[PDB]
Amino acid sequence: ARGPKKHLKRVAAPKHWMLDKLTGVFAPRPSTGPHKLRECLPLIIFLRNRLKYALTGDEVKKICMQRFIKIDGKVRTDITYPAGFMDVISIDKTGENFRLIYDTKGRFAVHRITPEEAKYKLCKVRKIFVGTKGIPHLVTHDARTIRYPDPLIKVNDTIQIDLETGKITDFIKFDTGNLCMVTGGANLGRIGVITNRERHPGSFDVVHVKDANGNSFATRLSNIFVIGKGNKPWISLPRGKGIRLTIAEERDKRLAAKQSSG
């Protein structure tokens, strides 16, 4: 390598894109953007695989360049734009808004939201600096640099922000008894109430989180996204409530579904 790589092979592509094995050698290289190449969803994969609107890459070209797709209320024409977590996608022609939220199994679900819900989003604050004549700045997980926040906002908190105005509206503090979602590791997509945060100066803060069914698990601190103040979440949720069904009881549900409709 003499410079930045620009191609991505299909088998090296993030597994959660559920790409095939046999259509091609390459995968969409997500452009550089507000989200990591692994923790994201290129617009083409969301449009021609999840929704089946387009059938080729060229039909995604024909859709995105007509200016129907909007990510966070701004028209985005890039076909491989990195759309990520807590992300609002709006299509005005069909009049439908989805949110990208992690699935129970760790993938991205297509979660259809109310157009009332599409006006706001949640951003986990990532760092807080004070620059240029005492002006405070937040950097969130979408790289949204926000000047002049609430002084109570500290790192690892969440801020609910408005998409149109770009300003923060209200913040959820990182505290035990707050409903969080996991954004990485084996526990990805599981949603539960924070019980304990343990400190390791030097290394990574491991956090113990109790699920809705009483199945406690743990994560590193960076993989935690806070949503609910208390037990009530600040957003709508997928068809599963974020609880990880184990294999045998999932098969039980499958067999019950076959018995229900025949």
Partner: protein
């Protein structure tokens, strides 16, 4: 770099002793009973049975309340029941070891044509299977190794396009009927 897959398996294992009388004896007996082309078919069924038994051996050694043992074993027992080998009474992973090769050879579509009376010889069953005369539900199957399931066992028919079925007698009847 290509958009292809090279994953492939060999579905038989040749025996280690090449010419021992009892092995050749048993294989030739099964060839006779179930009407097969060569010894590779018997080796194929024996290798599939060895696969199932090896899975059961790996599953017995685990503890009874192991979630992996439970899930894998119950799925395997469901699979062998749906083929038509095990019985609903003996759905235990212990009984999987008590399986024999002919319990899999009885489920071939060749033998299911033979037993159910669709044909009259097992070579006759094979020659009807190859020539597109036997269908399952609504699909004409041409393969004499189709392992027929229990729910699929009930209705095997004449493949209505066949002369034995709906109509259209073949080339021989058509030619002999236009002799004069």
């Amino acid at each position: 770099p290509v958009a292809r897959s090279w994953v492939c398996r060999k579905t038989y294992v040749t025996p280690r002793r090449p010419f021992e009388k009892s092995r050749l004896d048993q294989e030739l007996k099964l060839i006779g009973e179930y009407g097969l082309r060569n010894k590779r078919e018997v080796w194929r069924v024996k290798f599939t049975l060895a696969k199932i038994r090896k899975a059961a051996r790996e599953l017995l050694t685990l503890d009874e309340k192991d979630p992996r043992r439970l899930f894998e074993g119950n799925a395997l027992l469901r699979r062998l029941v749906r083929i038509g080998v095990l019985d609903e009474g003996k759905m235990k992973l212990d009984y999987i070891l008590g399986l024999k090769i002919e319990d899999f050879l009885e489920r071939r579509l060749q033998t299911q044509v033979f037993k159910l009376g669709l044909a009259k010889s097992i070579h006759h069953a094979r020659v009807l299977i190859r020539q597109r005369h036997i269908r399952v539900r609504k699909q004409v199957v041409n393969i004499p190794s189709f392992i027929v399931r229990l729910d699929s066992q009930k209705h095997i028919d004449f493949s209505l396009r066949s002369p034995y079925g709906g109509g259209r007698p073949g080339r021989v009847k058509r030619k002999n009927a236009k002799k004069g």
